[PDB]
Write a protein that binds this DNA or RNA. Structure first.
Ligand SMILES: [K+]
Ligand SMILES: [K+]
Ligand SMILES: [K+]
Ligand SMILES: [K+]
Ligand SMILES: [Mg+2]
Ligand SMILES: [Mg+2]
Ligand SMILES: [Mg+2]
Ligand SMILES: [Mg+2]
Ligand SMILES: [Mg+2]
Ligand SMILES: [Mg+2]
Ligand SMILES: [Mg+2]
Ligand SMILES: [Mg+2]
Ligand SMILES: [Mg+2]
Ligand SMILES: [Mg+2]
Ligand SMILES: [Mg+2]
Ligand SMILES: [Mg+2]
Ligand SMILES: [Mg+2]
Ligand SMILES: [Mg+2]
Ligand SMILES: [Mg+2]
Ligand SMILES: [Mg+2]
Ligand SMILES: [Mg+2]
Ligand SMILES: [Mg+2]
Ligand SMILES: [Mg+2]
Ligand SMILES: [Mg+2]
Ligand SMILES: [Mg+2]
Ligand SMILES: [Mg+2]
Ligand SMILES: [Mg+2]
Ligand SMILES: [Mg+2]
Ligand SMILES: [Mg+2]
Ligand SMILES: [Mg+2]
Ligand SMILES: [Mg+2]
Ligand SMILES: [Mg+2]
Ligand SMILES: [Mg+2]
Lengths: 134, 86
RNA sequence: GAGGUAUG
RNA sequence: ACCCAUGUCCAGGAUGAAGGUAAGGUAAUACUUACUGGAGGUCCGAACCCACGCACGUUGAAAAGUGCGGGGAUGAGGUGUG
RNA sequence: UUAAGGAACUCGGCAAAAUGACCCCGUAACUUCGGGAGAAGGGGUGCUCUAUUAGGGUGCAAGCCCGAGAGAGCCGCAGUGAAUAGGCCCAGGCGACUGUUUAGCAAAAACACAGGUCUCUGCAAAACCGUAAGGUGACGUAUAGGGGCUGACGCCUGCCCGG
RNA sequence: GUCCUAAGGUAGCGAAAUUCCUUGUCGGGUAAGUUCCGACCCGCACGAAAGGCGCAACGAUCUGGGCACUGUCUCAACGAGA
RNA sequence: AUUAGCUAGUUGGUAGGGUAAUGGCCUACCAAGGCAACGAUGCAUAGCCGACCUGAGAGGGUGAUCGGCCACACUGGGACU
RNA sequence: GCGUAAAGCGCGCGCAGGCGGUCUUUUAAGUCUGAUGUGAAAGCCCCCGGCUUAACCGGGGAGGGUCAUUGGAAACUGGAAGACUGGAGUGCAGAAGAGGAGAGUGGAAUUCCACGUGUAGCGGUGAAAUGCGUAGAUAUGUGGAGGAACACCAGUGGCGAAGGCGACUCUCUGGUCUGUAACUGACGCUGAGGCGCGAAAGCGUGGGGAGCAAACAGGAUUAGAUACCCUGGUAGUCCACGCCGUAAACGAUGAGUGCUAAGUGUUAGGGGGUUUCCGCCCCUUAGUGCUGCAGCUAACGCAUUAAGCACUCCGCCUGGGGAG
RNA sequence: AGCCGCCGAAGGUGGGACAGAUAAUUGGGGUGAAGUCGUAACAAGGUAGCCGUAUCGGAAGGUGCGGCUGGAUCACCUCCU
């Protein structure tokens, strides 16, 4: 462009989207108005639990839970690891992370933080999946 | 616009006896031409190709007129009442 | 070399 | 009831169409603002005409009215004479 | 005229009450850009002095009428002090409208309306009245006249000709 | 796919001035709503000049709700006149 | 600018009063200016800076802790001392 | 960065702004420069020291401002006063042109009407059939009516900002190029926001409507055929006026200026050598096309009509889709 | 002291504007190992494709009007190497 063009309008960079929009919103009951606050993790209440058929190429059933977070946003969270404790009205803690197999999931459930009891029988990567040392 | 009439209207407003390329002369001849073309358009309203050249004459006239205004303002305030502008 | 005139 | 010819009636106020003039504006038109103008099965509202509601009357003051409100009221108007 | 309440009445707010006049501020959705609109919602109105008033009208002038704001005050519950003089808003169906109608139970969503469309008619038109003459039509002439249907405006009006 | 047809209802609208069942269902409004508004569509039995759908202004039109106002009422009392 | 007009003590002036002090700070009278596409007006956002993190640097993001300044003490207004 | 990948408004007229030919003087708005003052401490940076080193802490210095005042330079930008002409324009002499609007006009040729001659087919297809035809066609001749478009010329030829413009004549008009150096003397380039124009389709009102023809009907086709195909055929197409303002609106290539090898056609001009004009040759201007050197490009390819080398201005792009 | 006046926060009333949440219902969008009807495009994609527009149609899409080549095979014409 010409310099006069660049002065009449300077540049404008790209509008960045977050991987994790719902972690980046807080709530106050008083105002009843969402408040932008960068957050790593949120807790919620499992509305629904179920299985998913993932994309091509894959075919295994994937465990998800539809959660209502603390801030009121309804979110689908993958339940990683072998087996789980969860059911309806179960409280859950939620971190970000995208299940590439599965279309509508963008977040994971931290395993071992709350009523998400740790995985059974696991020995390796225990800090993930939330088993104590035996 | 005929040659004889053109010669008349250049020689009767020429600043001096040699001159036929002054802004006085050009602005005058343009006012003749644009008035004849205003008549032409009021008759043949949809000859937009003619209306193009009309607006080019008007633009050139305004250009000369601004230059004259910047150059000597007395020439300007003379010509406007001598010709019928504004 | 160019221009124109049924399914998997 | 409809019509024919001929007459006559409609207090007062309001709104402000077209058009026109002028200033601005233009290359010239547009166009804007003001003023003027006086249009309308226009508005408000008496007379005039009608008859929406209610009440009273209902061997009525009256064989269809009275009272309180109501609609139109320059028009597809009302009315007179023949 | 009525305590308190205020549509609980009732087929139904029937009736009644309330609003009401001049000026000023301000005024929505929608709109066929004209309207809606007096929308709504609110304020002020009396008398006295400044006042033969600022200013206007008239007149040869004297004089005679209209009376603009403002201040400064006065009195009352209340100042268009009486009488006369819109209740408003939201939503919807129907009919566009003004108008007409069952004199004497129905005023309407019915009739008409402008507009659309079909159809007929060549002029001694067609259609109508009448036995006929004679007339209307029309002292007109298919951009006119008669009949049928529809019923402003906007977007549209589909298929079927066997009967 | 097949019968019948002259051809089988288009748009638009739709428990409708039309919807029986039917106080249909859902939503709204109300403490409570067979009425009301908006949507749905199994349109008993809408539908395109017996016009369809829509629509500003208009209306003594019909309908539902609200503010104000009130002897309509709770529940009647007084006064005046005929 | 998917916000273009805004302002009416608003702009200037003559007088007057007021503050510790200049000034429409306020009052009265006169004129009708003034600002604005060099983005006024309006909406949303935000305390500002030193500085912090990053980056070859230009620059990008932040304004915890430390220091400076500003603002506010349940919300609003007002004065006294 | 925008030919083909995303990206040049469809094109113009032009207010504002940005940018601006050569020379002299004047200034010092911008620029450059010496001095003074300040830009706190802490923090970054450098140099020392201290905590068993480190982290940390201390001392000192440095840096940092489109900072301000004051004093100097005039090269460039800007302001001012003059002068000049290669830009820009007027004049003068010529040349081309389907540039546009209006009015009128011509004959081919499709259809239709009438009349003769005239007898059983015509039409169409891959085959057909629907359809027209003994109430007489098809064709053939004559005459008449109606409208729409304009063969040859006609050509990568002309003009136009683009859309686009082809039969002829007249009127009214626009723009272009060539030559001159007469005249003015930078008057200019672009151009947001505005204003207008703007294929075909389409919309409103009123005409016209011959052909072609969406829709639609019938006949075939097909598994089916809401299509290709046939026969018919309404809107439209045409005109006047006014809206609509889109396009594979495309050279998919913004306007302007200058510079950087050639070869060759073609158009409109000019200049000169030769020759009886004619004719050939060369030089040059503005266009339009072909092929190619450098150079650029991812390549294809562009190549004095750059997609090269540079400057000014505008518009636009920032992964696909959603989503125009 | 009291009283009267000016300014004056909150409050009340009123109608508009602005921003958001929600809503019977509705619209299209997208995603989703193996469902459905057809085959519109890619080659001449079997009617050449595509742009705009109108209309029609279960759906892709078709037809008309104009426009482009981002058009395959065959032809004469211009032009070049
Ligand atoms: K229903
Ligand atoms: K002030
Ligand atoms: K038409
Ligand atoms: K083209
Ligand atoms: Mg296949
Ligand atoms: Mg009237
Ligand atoms: Mg009335
Ligand atoms: Mg009465
Ligand atoms: Mg009246
Ligand atoms: Mg009488
Ligand atoms: Mg009589
Ligand atoms: Mg009472
Ligand atoms: Mg009481
Ligand atoms: Mg009740
Ligand atoms: Mg009861
Ligand atoms: Mg009543
Ligand atoms: Mg009526
Ligand atoms: Mg009666
Ligand atoms: Mg009655
Ligand atoms: Mg009629
Ligand atoms: Mg007779
Ligand atoms: Mg009727
Ligand atoms: Mg009822
Ligand atoms: Mg019909
Ligand atoms: Mg009436
Ligand atoms: Mg804040
Ligand atoms: Mg970098
Ligand atoms: Mg592209
Ligand atoms: Mg420091
Ligand atoms: Mg057209
Ligand atoms: Mg195909
Ligand atoms: Mg194909
Ligand atoms: Mg078709």
């Amino acid at each position: 462009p010409t310099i006069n063009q660049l002065v009449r309008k300077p540049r404008q960079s790209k509008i960045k989207k977050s991987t994790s929009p719902a972690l980046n919103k807080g709530l106050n009951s008083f105002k009843r108005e969402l408040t932008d606050v960068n957050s790593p993790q949120k807790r919620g209440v499992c509305t629904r639990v179920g299985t998913m058929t993932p994309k091509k190429p894959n075919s295994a059933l994937r465990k998800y839970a539809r959660v209502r977070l603390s801030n009121g946003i309804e979110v689908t969270a993958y339940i990683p690891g072998i087996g789980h404790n969860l059911q309806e009205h179960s409280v859950v803690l939620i971190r970000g992370g995208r299940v590439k197999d599965l279309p509508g999931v963008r977040y994971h459930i931290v395993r071992g933080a709350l009523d998400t009891a740790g995985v059974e029988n696991r020995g390796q990567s225990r800090s993930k999946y939330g088993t104590k040392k035996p | 616009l005929t040659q004889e009439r053109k010669n008349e209207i250049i020689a009767e407003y020429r600043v001096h006896d040699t001159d036929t390329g002054s802004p006085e002369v050009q602005i005058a001849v343009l006012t003749a031409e644009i008035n004849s073309l205003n008549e032409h358009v009021r008759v043949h309203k949809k000859d937009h190709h003619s209306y193009r050249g009309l607006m080019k004459m008007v633009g050139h006239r305004r250009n000369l007129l601004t230059y004259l205004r910047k150059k000597d303002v007395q020439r300007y305030r003379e010509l406007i009442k001598r010709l019928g502008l504004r």
